[model samples]
Target chain A: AYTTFSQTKNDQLKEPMFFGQPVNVARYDQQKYDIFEKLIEKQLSFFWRPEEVDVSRDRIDYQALPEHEKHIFISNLKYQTLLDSIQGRSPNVALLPLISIPELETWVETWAFSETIHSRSYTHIIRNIVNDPSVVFDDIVTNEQIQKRAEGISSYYDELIEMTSYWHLLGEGTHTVNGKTVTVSLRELKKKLYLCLMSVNALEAIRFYVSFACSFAFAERELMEGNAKIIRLIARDEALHLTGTQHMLNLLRSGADDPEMAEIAEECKQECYDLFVQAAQQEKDWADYLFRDGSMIGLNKDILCQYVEYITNIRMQAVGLDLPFQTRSNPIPWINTWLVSDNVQVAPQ
Target chain B: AYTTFSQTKNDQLKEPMFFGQPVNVARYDQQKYDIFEKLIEKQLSFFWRPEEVDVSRDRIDYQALPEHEKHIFISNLKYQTLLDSIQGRSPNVALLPLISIPELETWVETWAFSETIHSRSYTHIIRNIVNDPSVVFDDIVTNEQIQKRAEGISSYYDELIEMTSYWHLLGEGTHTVNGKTVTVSLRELKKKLYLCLMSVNALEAIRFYVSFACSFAFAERELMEGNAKIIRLIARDEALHLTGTQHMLNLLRSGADDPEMAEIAEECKQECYDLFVQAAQQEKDWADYLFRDGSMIGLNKDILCQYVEYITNIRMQAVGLDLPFQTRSNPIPWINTWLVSDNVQVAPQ
Candidate 1:
């Protein structure tokens, strides 16, 4: 049912964004949605290696930090590493088999590849700041605070991938596995994918921004400027990534591409809402862990939590979901200076 | 059995290259095999965009060529497009779930991402040369000569992906699917993965070089130099890609990474040899169709076939396979000028 290069000749522009047919020819002469092509173009232009950024001074800055502040810094770095660790491979693993449009197919690969760069940046920053980098990376799996968020984030993608495998292998039927009857339906799989994108959008839109605030807050105090520089670049890329998922969600709900997907989106609206709200709560809980030791100068637990609420509402509204949190202005408007870049187009048309 | 992010905190250095714990942290500080790290670094250094190279002049050159030469050029471009289209997504889909190490995981994504760049380069070149790029791109699916190769190329990946889906969904055991008994074995899955890598290596090593010969042959006459420039960049990247797969095969065969994989490599020796020989013959058959109308100046069916056999012997020997063809010197010596690049380390140490 799934072939790497689908040999059937079909007009790619007419295929749905996913699950129609696997893209055979990777051509960019034309696109059903030009936004993905634009995202690919923008992402290609935004390419940077972690080694290109000089983080030499960050080592000294880390040494000068007090014990509690050091805890705050390394914990934030560890959380960011966990986020990219999943983002680095999840999209391609969960989405590539299902993507149908050539532009979106390539966009998913490009999007996932950029996350790998972000992952490498963490390694670069950590290797510079800490003598033994494994100490930080190793803690990611065992750290209860980080692992809690990892489970929530990876579960959506994991469920979607599992159902996708069933759909591909069993072809929409009730099957017995280990004496358990499991059903695979295309419509149900579509719903899973819809909610999964919502979770990913929340991860990119809310969770990642919360971590960025922590990184940029240190730079706001005129310390760790090199680490901040790389985070700033990552923020720029995340802006595009969040936009990619937002557009996918929006398009799927709009019914322009797949009518069944629109129905699924309408059906899964409340679940999608809960997904975002849960993600927001997760980010807020992460704040307690980050500042548990002590709050840094430019940021604290309350302000980061407020920023989470503020951004969650905006991200929710962008996807046609009702605002889940109270309306408030940006908690850290100073973080905007770090967020905006020359190349990023944050808002979707 | 497969989660996007495994919560278990196993020492990643102790994991095998595949089918161990899913890599939880994306770290580069340490690697069981540093070659993948070096490959990732070299690949990142070779980052490029299709828009960076100017293909405007190729339009005029393409228009001036004889009908047969035009046939040769367009066919080669379409074939290259098919190869990249499959490569741009297949590695991530088929291999990511099985990969257990961070360095190799990132290297696969980096390797796949570079192929997307190559896919984009074809669009850039095709759009410049033709008013309607669809005529070239659309034929890729229905074209008999191309689809013949696509079927063989995609089957290896498709089978591996299917077996992987089963292994992940239902652990190694026999199961009933649509009234047929299917047994899933981890060792058999490993063998599928091993052959898939070999098929991919052959695609990168043999099939891509044949297409490169067609592209560079025009540049040898000082025609279509712009397309040659893009292909030259692609060849440089392919050197790294082929090296990556060769090292993986050699390592698996050497039993250093996975002792079972070494056993599987030894067991599948003839099948591996047959895979390469079949690929070499397929490329030779493609040469016949390529020059069916007429032959270009610097390249003909006979010479291209000879080049196929010559390159096949070297590539085959590199992976411990007995040479399937008689030894011969380079057919197109001038190709070395275009193939050589500063950053590429062609041979694995």
Candidate 2:
């Protein structure tokens, strides 16, 4: 059984990222990978409040938009809500039990906590624009478009979580569960964690960036600047979040921490590649849905689809995976102005 | 199986705190419990970096301390690190699976994340004062004084987690496990949650405050003022945490959200009372351990024990439990000057 505080006094500096001894003491004085500690510090430095952004004018800007524009904005908001809704809880739930080192454990919790703030930011943005935010929030579940992506996003996490329960309960053996023989392999479980992280990396790297493009495209036109301000801060944090996961994935693959994880990463490369491509396709499909009504001034389906491919290649390459999309330049270079590079504050324009 | 994001379209505003449908959409426009939303908002607003606290002076202050006084300070610091190490991870692992509302789920994650920051702060304080930070960090797992308290704190979370896994997998029914019949009842599971919250309530309200008294005592003598600055900030965050759990218990007891939990709360009264009393005694025992070397100037075993009893009564009564000890005036009323009631700012006084 997985105890909350493992009694064994092992060197946390020697523990693997996952499937080693559970983190008994959360000390950040030292780290097996200093990057997570740096990430946590940078993320804490990036702490922000959603209500501090002046969204009062967002209501005015939202009301002035045409119906199709409203659809694009609201639909994009719903999707952002969906992504954060899952990201907020999944990292802590699926990752905490498996994490062995203290810095990474705290990093995962800090990363997930940042997502909840993002979730809160979405509600902040939505409440400012719509009278009854429930209509927008409720559609997140019932809308086939969002729900489809929700499944695609949550499946890897759910599988890892379920398998982890069995692993913790039975501890890497075949057991009779529900009168049926079931096997829990540690290697297979590590594979799930690796793939789940790959999925999460894609989430923070590609999906959130796409949403940021949508939110910032409005700001580029000087509309919904308040929502864009919140998204900029969120993107600032998400950049660190994706960086955290990418480090985890790359570290596992390097064979420095866990030799078995390197083998698992090698074995799962094709599957990882396919997962990223699948996620990119879903984002492209979502762009279609967002622009089905009509296209906005600087962004539409073709541009967003190219941007998705553009981001997927960069993100995949970060984790030592093959790039699934053909090489391409930035489709929306103007977005660089709003994306807010490192250490840049989200100034209210 | 429990999913990170439940696909069901349930009205989150109507769900109970636990054992209802898992939160699907992370919406904050409305809330079943507004206090949690407020808590989340307040915690974010209270965010501070550990490095921001200039503990450099503490190294000089610590080197000047007498042997027994150094014993008092380092041991107290170790105990605080152990407490936060558990808190940093337990809430999310044990509570996230059962949380039904978006606000409370986010609150739990935010709460856990803040605890991780506290853990980091301890490392900051330790690294500054000690030759080898690992010795202090390593002792947390092996220290008998700390381990005794660790089991007391983690048992509630561990039991609930084991039962929760069974409930999620087998789903509130009888099952044969390891050649023995087991019954997983939602009622029993909920009772576990209630008592666990009560235990957590005691942890934050009483145990943490007791440790805070130790940290502030050094500052009372103009020694280790840097450490006191950090502890003051921690106490500020902890006040919010204890308040969060207390509201959850009170809301459940008042029959506002779940009628069944009110009955459970009433039924578990003696158990809840005993848990608080047990934690108080443990804190008193810990005080004995702390002062075994020698007593400090402003604080001693006699004063710390008396403060435990005083705060235990206040915290227990807040959640409608019987007082475990006779209410006495604050033994260290001057400690409040350091505690920073309500409006918490990390001022470098």
Best by DockQ: 1
Task: Flag regions of model 2 displaced more than 4 Å.
Answer: A344-349, B342-349
* Interface C-alpha RMSD, model 1: 1.1
Tell me the alpha-carbon RMSD of every candidate. Answer: 1.6, 2.8
| Clash pairs, model 1 backbone | none
RMSD value for candidate 2:
2.8
Worst 10 residues of 2 chain B by lDDT: B340-349
Relative to the true structure, how large is the alpha-carbon lDDT of every model? 0.91, 0.88
Q: What lDDT is reached at residue B67 by model 1?
A: 94
List the TM values for chain B, per candidate: 0.98, 0.97
Task: Label model 1 with its docking quality class.
Answer: high
Q: Score residue B140 of candidate 2 by CA lDDT.
A: 88
Candidate by candidate, in order, the iRMS in Å equals 1.1, 1.1
